[PDB]
Paper text:
(A) Overall structure of the Wolbachia LeuRS complex with the adduct AMP-Cmpd6 bound into the editing site. In the absence of AMP, Cmpd6 and Cmpd9 did not bind to Wolbachia LeuRS; however, in the presence of AMP, the compounds were potent LeuRS inhibitors, with dissociation constants of 44 and 6 nM, respectively. The amido-thiazole group also packs against the adenosine ring; however, the π-π stacking is not entirely parallel compared to the phenyl of Cmpd9. Other key interactions, shared by the two compounds, are a hydrogen bond by the oxaborole oxygen-1 to T241; and the three hydrogen bonds established by the 3-aminomethyl to F322, D328, and D331.
The editing site of LeuRS plays a key role to maintain fidelity in protein translation by hydrolyzing tRNALeu mischarged to noncognate amino acids such as norvaline. The adducts then bind with potent nanomolar affinity into the Wolbachia LeuRS editing site and efficiently compete with the physiological substrate norvaline.
Residue numbers in the entry: 222 to 349, 359 to 394
Write the structure that this text describes.
Amino acid sequence: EGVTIEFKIVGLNKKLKVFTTCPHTLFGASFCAVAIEHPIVQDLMSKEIQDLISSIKIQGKNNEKVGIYTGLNVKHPFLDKELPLYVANFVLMEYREGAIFGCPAHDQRDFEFAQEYDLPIIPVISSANSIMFNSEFLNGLTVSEARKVIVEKLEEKGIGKKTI
Ligand SMILES: NC[C@H]1O[B@@-]2(O[C@@H]3[C@H](O2)[C@@H](COP(=O)(O)O)O[C@H]3n2cnc3c(N)ncnc32)c2c(OCCC(=O)Nc3nccs3)ccc(Br)c21
């Protein structure tokens, strides 16, 4: 069920690989997040943002789930839309890609993060398998059908591959 997705970094000839078990919820994407130790920090981020990540313990005042805006955005693969890229304290560096997409409507972790930083919350699975909405070509498909179609579309565009 898992898929590795390549997000294009806006303004750069560079890609970020993220992994999701829930690729059918991609139209609910509000952000992407990498671990503190992700090499994209040293490769692409400003001295000031690198300095912050190396000097400061990332811990929340109000909420435990917190992050640092990287100064980088990612292009949504199916919408004419940019997503902010964060370093977040709840992403494991050594687990899969050390990088996630945020779906606050359907992931309780992403939800708390999105609330903390006023990031968009976009519902895409109707409460009942359940029906997709706010999801363009996935609209009206069951979660099962949508999982199949989204992976086909990602593979067709060469931006996603099935990953066990
Ligand atoms: N967030 C949006 C969407 O993407 B999912 O979020 C990603 C990914 O699919 C999933 C990993 O899949 P897997 O268990 O290895 O098959 O966990 C998050 N993740 C992947 N790399 C990660 C990493 N370095 N550090 C922390 N977290 C990671 C995800 C959900 O996941 C549930 C399972 C989970 O939580 N599995 C976990 N595995 C290890 C820590 S959490 C649930 C709902 C939704 Br809508 C989603």
